[PDB]
Amino acid sequence: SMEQVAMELRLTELTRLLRSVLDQLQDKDPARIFAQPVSLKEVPDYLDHIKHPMDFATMRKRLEAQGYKNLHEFEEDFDLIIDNCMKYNARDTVFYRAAVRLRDQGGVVLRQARREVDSIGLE
């Protein structure tokens, strides 16, 4: 149907915008601490602590499969990256502090992304 196609076009547009947001957010992690999943080989107890791991590579895979239907779903995964890290690692670690900086700097990007999704009407 034409309606289905139109819906798919909107999703494709959302995916394009979220790809830009994702690139901007990942730029705020220059250490690449959050680039890849935490290695379960190197951190064998990780899943005892963290029930829903997340990282930028995993987000990018979902994004390219057009698996984010709206911005909230994308934000939920970004928040997992930060929140998981701030629980597993103590305040006096480079990991926790990287997450705080990513949260603080990412908030600016997400603030405007929300306005853009709303104004263009991508959800």
Ligand SMILES: Cn1c(=O)ccc2cc(N)ccc21
């Ligand atoms: C425990 N942990 C995190 O929580 C986040 C990122 C990270 C990166 C490496 N390379 C090792 C451990 C890590």
